[PDB]
Amino acid sequence: VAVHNLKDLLAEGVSGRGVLVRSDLNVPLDSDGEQGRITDPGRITASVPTLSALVEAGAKVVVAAHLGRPKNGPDPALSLAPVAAALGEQLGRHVQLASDVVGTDALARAEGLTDGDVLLLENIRFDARETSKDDAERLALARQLAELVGPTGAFVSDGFGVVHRKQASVYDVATLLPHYAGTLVAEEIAVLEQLTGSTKRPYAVVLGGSKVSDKLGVIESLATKADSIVIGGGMCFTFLAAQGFSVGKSLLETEMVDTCRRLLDTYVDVLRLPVDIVAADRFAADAAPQTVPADAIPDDLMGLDIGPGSVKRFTALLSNAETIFWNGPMGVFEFPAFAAGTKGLAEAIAAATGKGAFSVVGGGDSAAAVRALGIPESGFSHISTGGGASLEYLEGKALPGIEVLGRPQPT
Amino acid sequence: MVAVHNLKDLLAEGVSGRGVLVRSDLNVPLDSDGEQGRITDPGRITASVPTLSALVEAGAKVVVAAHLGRPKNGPDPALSLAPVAAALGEQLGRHVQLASDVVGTDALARAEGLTDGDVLLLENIRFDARETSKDDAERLALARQLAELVGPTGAFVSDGFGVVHRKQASVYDVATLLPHYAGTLVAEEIAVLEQLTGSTKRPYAVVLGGSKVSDKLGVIESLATKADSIVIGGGMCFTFLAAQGFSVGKSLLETEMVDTCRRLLDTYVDVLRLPVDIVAADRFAADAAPQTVPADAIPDDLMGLDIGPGSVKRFTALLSNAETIFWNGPMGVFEFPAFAAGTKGLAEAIAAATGKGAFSVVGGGDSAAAVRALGIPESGFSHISTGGGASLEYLEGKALPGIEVLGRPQPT
């Protein structure tokens, strides 16, 4: 397997060459009010380095991207028209928008492209074949997409959030054209490799969130790769119950207790549990915080955050790590009295990063909610935005949109 | 005869055993790259809880109407409220049942069976095409079915501000069928917007960013007779600089708005404040070569990407003098570290002023993305508006239909 990158494609030459780019242009839209208003253009900005490199090298660029999850064909609220306008402003050139995906208009505009021109097809998910489980359906669309750039063309995959599922514009079209990872996909792979296959040690993982069942895949995969896995958040009380401790009124996934016991028995001393807990008598911001030992949680209290002794032990652990992966809050950080555990670990990871650690923040858009606490993104080596795709990578699943890029080029 | 009664007023009338229809804002962002049904920011669910909790504790039979996204034509499984019902129940500490329809057989059966303190979430109200119809008769027919769920003795609480600027059945027409009240979020947002339009402590400083003048034109012209200062930054400042007769190189320029900006600069010469310097570059890229240039001397082959350090110092001093502050829109391309200084500096100045007693309001999805990326805690502002177009139209001076309807007399 050899995943070629954009620099490899540029080295081959793209002057006058049709290049199909799968971009991530799935920007949030206002759906309280009038249609077609982008509320965060960040993904458009992120798409520019790949597209600008191809434009300046003289490629004829055709872009496939989706917006939302259209139910059954064209949906005016999910037209890429506002995306084409915003993308052109950031690219410094007009971006044509086809009035269809692979119909009359797309074909005519693609045939007329000259060196450096950019054509955005309409929302690729308007076509029922794009997300079909039927291989023959996806192949039919993939062939039409490949015909837009021609048999001398190339394919660049630059949307990491869709590489974990077989979609025509992501997977099948890569079997039809010489294929390359774009700058975003290549960078996410390079980061995720440092968390799975090529780990600089000590490697510390920090996992939070509410349910063990949601994190089980990542825990089991990383337990054979990391030196420590710090367990916080709401899910930590299920592990504490598996230790034989009572957890009062805390969140508890009773059906996962025996699984947590198996993990603690199997991956001995990898998992690091809280030693103290900030508990309260009710789920309220104004509830009196009580710091209790993790083995002496009172029956009438619920745990809402990891305690200061836990933050202290976890911080010391993180200060020695070469590699840090963090996904999920340590407590109910919306309540300021129960935000200290999350803020404390964020500060520890940023501090370690400033002294040389490689730190990756998982979660993508979900983790941005935590950053309402005042946590600058620049404090970390890499913010992963790959969502479910990134998590499945960490779980050790083979991602079809990545695997296909490593195949030999079609002859 | 105009009085917008609030939730305290409704509770004083009594809601024990009473059906109360609440229009909530539960339009949370979802992941649409991968599998359906994954909420990526539950903030709006958290915000909805105070109104719902108050009604639950007072014994109300609570029926919640809310939308998710913009369904094209009927039910859409990606836009079901199922994950919202689960998350809302977790925050309420009680089961929230999802009806399998909006005003159909299941909604009717479950509303009729509700008991004191129960919360029923109807399926996505926009699964019914009548909800957003321009036709009053269609909206009123749906509104009658919604009101039937809580019965003739019921009440209506409007608690989603972002939809009050357009007529929708669950927001506007149903308020004509029942005793009607603003919920805690709508009452709070109105009180905030009143400070920004009517009476508020001076000096009153407004800071507007983002890319397009035309998006902010109505707000600028409305607030220019109210605020002591309006700072213009972001991409839209270059259209104002062009309006002054200066060239702006490769900078973003709304040529159709140049004449309008000139008129605004002439009329409100004492209110509008433009940047005095700009950070410019030859490419739209984080590692482009940056130059700090006077705002009235942008070189021809450069594009302006941030306000400059002299501008940051001047605007920071202005915000440090303000008793009331309204901010909407980034000052530059903060996604690039080299062009984040203007947005970081302004947001930090507003938080500092707020810590020293100023009343600060932030609006806009791009402003929110910026404060989250740049490490300014949301708790550092007096109020973060999530209202969107509705808040902007209120600030433009438009009375909004979803607010007007709540001020009508209660039924007799």
From Swiss-Prot, chain B:
Residues at which ATP binds: 216, 304, 335, 364-367
Highest taxon of the lineage: Bacteria
Gene behind this protein: pgk
Record-given protein name: Phosphoglycerate kinase
Pathway: Carbohydrate degradation; glycolysis; pyruvate from D-glyceraldehyde 3-phosphate: step 2/5
Keywords noted in UniProt: ATP-binding, Cytoplasm, Glycolysis, Kinase, Nucleotide-binding, Transferase
GO biological process: gluconeogenesis; glycolytic process
Pfam families in the record: PGK (PF00162)
Stored SUPFAM superfamilies: Phosphoglycerate kinase (SSF53748)
Family classification: Belongs to the phosphoglycerate kinase family.
